[PDB]
Ligand SMILES: [Ca+2]
């Protein structure tokens with residue numbers, strides 16, 4: 001399908017993979033950025049279903065969701081168990097979603113909210 005970068009600057013919102021909760025497209029390199037005002041911190045909560053194609057022995061060899069908080073890597077995620085809720089201590093988050101050439105997985109969706117410092 002697509003995948004231009006997306007930018008979210010409201011105090012809360014939803015972010016999901018393309019066509020959620022139907023299969024996300026292959027060969028994606030998607031960048032989602034959240035930028036809110038200094039003195040707010042971002043909290044991320046994934047919803048169910050969460051389904052990124054995985055592998056029984058290799059960590060995330062096929063498709064990957066990577067999360068950055070002000071440039072620092074705070075996790076790479078795949079599989080069927082959603083990540084735990086993330087308190088990022090940051091006003092700047094980036095999610096990078098990479099997908100390979102095949103598979104039918106339902107993808108991911110999160111809600112972010114902001115905490116007042
Ligand atoms: Ca795949």
Ligand code: NA
Pocket residue numbers: 017018019020021022023024025105106107108
């Ligand atoms: Na999807």
